Amino acid sequence: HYGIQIRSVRPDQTSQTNVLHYLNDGQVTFRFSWRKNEYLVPVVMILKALCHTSDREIFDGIIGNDVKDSFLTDRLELLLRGFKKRYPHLQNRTQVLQYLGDKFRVVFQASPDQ
Amino acid sequence: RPSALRNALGEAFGTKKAKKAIADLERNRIDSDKLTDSAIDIVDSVRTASKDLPTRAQL
Amino acid sequence: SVVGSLIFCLDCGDLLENPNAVLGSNVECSQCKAIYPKSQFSNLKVVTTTADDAFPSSLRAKKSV
Ligand SMILES: [Zn+2]
């Protein structure tokens, strides 16, 4: 049931609602909307997509000094290790971007150009 | 491109993907070929059934 | 580096593959080449507990007075 909702609005006041979901499995999935249809992506993908970073930078980003949350230590290990399970071949951020472009190229209408 | 679209769909939704896949199941090969021959025979039956109406417009 | 039950690549920071899924000792990094269990192991253990929420009862209230 738990989840976060942030309504990001661009300077021009056009809005875009972004949701985070906690799966029972520890997995977190991100909801968004494109061509007013909804689309779900694993959050660790959008993280590795934003900036080149280490796994330790994301881990440190979330729990940080909070080293005592066995609850969070284990859920977050499920998250990162689980991503390592699904995508052993996304070794760098650029490749990840290639995976996103490849999977949305049909709908972002950028093709024969981008 | 539709197939590629399907891939995008695969990432987005398990459930919706399931629905589209179901649509594919419904299609199947569509015209089967052996089936097509049998159907041709059926078409002959249709010939009998057919509403042999006329030229429609010229008349 | 090893923290809690996570072990990060010491050179690259990658949460390298668990010493349990290795045949050698040195868990080698998928980004770096470092040894590991070849070097021992973070005797991975966590003292996990209940949140003191799963178990409502009058007796829980008897812990409150
Ligand atoms: Zn490394």
UniProtKB/Swiss-Prot annotation, chain A:
Location of the protein in the cell: Nucleus, Nucleolus
Domain of life: Eukaryota
Miscellaneous comment: Three distinct zinc-containing RNA polymerases are found in eukaryotic nuclei: polymerase I for the ribosomal RNA precursor, polymerase II for the mRNA precursor, and polymerase III for 5S and tRNA genes.
Stated role: DNA-dependent RNA polymerases catalyze the transcription of DNA into RNA using the four ribonucleoside triphosphates as substrates. Component of RNA polymerase I (Pol I) which synthesizes ribosomal RNA precursors. Besides, RNA polymerase I has intrinsic RNA cleavage activity. RPA190 and RPA135 both contribute to the polymerase catalytic activity and together form the Pol I active center. In addition, subunit RPA12 contributes a catalytic zinc ribbon that is required for RNA cleavage by Pol I.
Family classification: Belongs to the RNA polymerase beta chain family.
Subunit-level organization: Component of the RNA polymerase I (Pol I) complex consisting of 14 subunits: RPA135, RPA190, RPC40, RPA14, RPB5, RPO26, RPA43, RPB8, RPA12, RPB10, RPC19, RPC10, RPA49 and RPA34. The complex is composed of a horseshoe-shaped core containing ten subunits (RPA135, RPA190, RPB5, RPO26, RPB8, RPB10, RPC10, RPA12, RPC19 and RPC40) where RPA135 and RPA190 form the DNA-binding cleft. Outside of the core, RPA14 and RPA43 form the stalk that mediates interactions with transcription initiation factors and newly synthesized RNA.
The name this protein goes by in its record: DNA-directed RNA polymerase I subunit RPA135
Organism: Saccharomyces cerevisiae (strain ATCC 204508 / S288c) (Baker's yeast)
Gene name linked to the record: RPA135
Shown part of the complete sequence: 231 to 344 of 1203
UniProtKB/Swiss-Prot annotation, chain B:
Function comment: DNA-dependent RNA polymerases catalyze the transcription of DNA into RNA using the four ribonucleoside triphosphates as substrates. Component of RNA polymerase I (Pol I) which synthesizes ribosomal RNA precursors. Besides, RNA polymerase I has intrinsic RNA cleavage activity. The heterodimer formed by RPA34 and RPA49 stimulates transcript elongation by Pol I. Subunit RPA49 can bind both single-stranded and double-stranded DNA.
Family: Belongs to the eukaryotic RPA49/POLR1E RNA polymerase subunit family.
Phosphoserine, modified sites: 32
Any coiled-coil regions, as ranges: none
Assembly notes: Component of the RNA polymerase I (Pol I) complex consisting of 14 subunits: RPA135, RPA190, RPC40, RPA14, RPB5, RPO26, RPA43, RPB8, RPA12, RPB10, RPC19, RPC10, RPA49 and RPA34. The complex is composed of a horseshoe-shaped core containing ten subunits (RPA135, RPA190, RPB5, RPO26, RPB8, RPB10, RPC10, RPA12, RPC19 and RPC40) where RPA135 and RPA190 form the DNA-binding cleft. Outside of the core, RPA14 and RPA43 form the stalk that mediates interactions with transcription initiation factors and newly synthesized RNA.
Protein name: DNA-directed RNA polymerase I subunit RPA49
Record's subcellular location: Nucleus, Nucleolus
Organism: Saccharomyces cerevisiae (strain ATCC 204508 / S288c)
Part of the full-length chain shown: 120 to 178 of 415
From Swiss-Prot, chain C:
Region (Necessary and sufficient for recruitment into Pol I): 1-65
Full protein stretch here: 2 to 66 of 125
Keyword annotations: DNA-directed RNA polymerase, Metal-binding, Nucleus, Ribosome biogenesis, Transcription, Zinc, Zinc-finger
Chain residues that bind Zn(2+) 1: 9, 12, 29, 32
GO BP terms: negative regulation of transcription by RNA polymerase II; nucleolar large rRNA transcription by RNA polymerase I; ribosome biogenesis; termination of RNA polymerase I transcription; transcription by RNA polymerase I; transcription elongation by RNA polymerase I; transcription initiation at RNA polymerase I promoter
Zinc finger (C4-type): 9-32
Protein name per UniProt: DNA-directed RNA polymerase I subunit RPA12
GO molecular function: DNA-directed RNA polymerase activity; nucleic acid binding; RNA polymerase II-specific DNA-binding transcription factor binding; zinc ion binding
Keyword Transcription set for record: yes
Role noted for this protein: DNA-dependent RNA polymerases catalyze the transcription of DNA into RNA using the four ribonucleoside triphosphates as substrates. Component of RNA polymerase I (Pol I) which synthesizes ribosomal RNA precursors. Besides, RNA polymerase I has intrinsic RNA cleavage activity. Proposed to contribute to the polymerase catalytic activity and form the polymerase active center together with the two largest subunits. Subunit RPA12 contributes a catalytic zinc ribbon that is required for RNA cleavage by Pol I. Involved in transcriptional termination.
Region listing for Interaction with RPA2, in residue ranges: 1-59
Family membership: Belongs to the archaeal RpoM/eukaryotic RPA12/RPB9/RPC11 RNA polymerase family.
GO CC entries: nucleus; RNA polymerase I complex
Location in or out of the cell: Nucleus, Nucleolus
Misc remark: Present with 8450 molecules/cell in log phase SD medium.
Keyword Secreted appears in the UniProt entry: no
Phylogenetic lineage: Eukaryota, Fungi, Dikarya, Ascomycota, Saccharomycotina
